[PDB]
């Protein structure tokens, strides 16, 4: 039994994405109140977005959430930094999302073959980015980031996370 408590005002989307992606691999509860943090042996804790994603992706190896290569592992980490720096607060967003538009050109997932942490993480921060939301209502988006955002948005566990936390 590993349990995470979520920041009830501002759920860390992407955290729960992984939690609902890793339900059938390890025992997990979600509680609310307080702030967003995860308890694993409860002497050892994690309380930051990218720590929790990595830890769950590492424990539920039955899931493929961390990729298969060491290269893919390195990418997945790369993506978490990118989203936590360049998509956290916007400045040079145009060049920020040029790059996400650019590398998504030939990729269905950021991963290569399948859904991995990169996606859950990037998609979650994109969503909470309002500058990119402004690209949406003005219909002036990067076309590859759109299909990718829409594709993932439409998916099963992605829709459930929405329904509980919007």
């Amino acid at each position: 039994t590993l349990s995470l408590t979520v920041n009830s005002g501002d759920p860390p989307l992407g955290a729960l994405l992984a939690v609902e992606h890793v339900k059938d691999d390890v025992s997990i509860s979600v509680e609310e109140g307080k702030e967003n943090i995860l308890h694993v042996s409860e002497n050892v804790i994690f309380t930051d977005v990218n720590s929790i994603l990595r830890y769950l992706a590492r424990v539920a190896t039955t899931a493929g959430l961390y990729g298969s290569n060491l290269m893919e592992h390195t990418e997945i980490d790369h993506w978490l930094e990118f989203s936590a720096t360049k998509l956290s607060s916007s400045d040079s967003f145009t060049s920020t999302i040029n790059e996400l538009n650019h590398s998504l050109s030939l990729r269905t997932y950021l991963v290569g073959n399948s859904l991995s942490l990169a996606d859950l993480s990037v998609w979650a921060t994109l969503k909470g980015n309002a500058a990119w939301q402004e690209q949406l209502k003005q219909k002036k988006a990067p076309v590859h980031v759109k299909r990718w955002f829409g594709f993932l948005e439409a998916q099963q566990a992605f829709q459930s996370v929405g329904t509980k936390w919007d």
Binding site: H102, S105, L106, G112, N113, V143, K146, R147, G150, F151
Partner: protein
């Protein structure tokens, strides 16, 4: 270039069917034919295929919603007509590129038999494509690379190279 009976043997394993049927061919068009174990003889590529999909118990390959099934037949017709393609395949590639700009799959967001079939039928073309043309047909490239690396689909078909970004 690849006989439709050869295509169906390849599809059986794509799907995960263990059993492999004898297939005939009829006439100079060389249409695939199945002396069947459930009715009258089955005929044509997409009919046999539908059957195998059904044999495999993976119906969701022909769509769930009425509207996705109409999309699924649309690409099935497309494959028998426009794909089985001599003078100019570019016109097809151009079109598909625009269709594919906002779509992972040929049905909106889902994997269907359309993707498998359109992939097999286009394979001989996309192989003979240059590094430059694959840039020009960006969304095609993406979708194809995606289908090749879809579980169980490629089998013994050739890998096309696709500069990653």
């Amino acid at each position: 270039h690849m006989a439709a009976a050869a295509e169906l043997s390849l599809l059986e394993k794509s799907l995960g069917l263990s059993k492999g049927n004898k297939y005939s061919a009829q006439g100079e068009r060389q249409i695939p034919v199945l002396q069947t174990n459930n009715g009258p003889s089955l005929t044509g590529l997409t009919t046999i295929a539908a059957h195998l999909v059904k044999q495999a118990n993976k119906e969701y390959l022909l769509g769930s919603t009425a509207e996705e099934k109409a999309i699924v037949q649309q690409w099935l017709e497309y494959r028998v007509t426009q794909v089985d393609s001599k003078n100019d395949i570019h016109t097809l590639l151009k079109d598909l590129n625009s269709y594919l700009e906002d779509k992972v799959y040929l049905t909106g967001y889902n994997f269907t038999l359309a993707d498998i079939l359109l992939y097999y039928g286009l394979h001989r073309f996309i192989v003979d494509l240059t590094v430059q043309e694959k840039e020009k047909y960006l969304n095609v490239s993406r979708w194809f690379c995606h289908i090749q690396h879809y579980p169980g689909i490629r089998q013994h078909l050739s890998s096309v190279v696709f500069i990653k970004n």
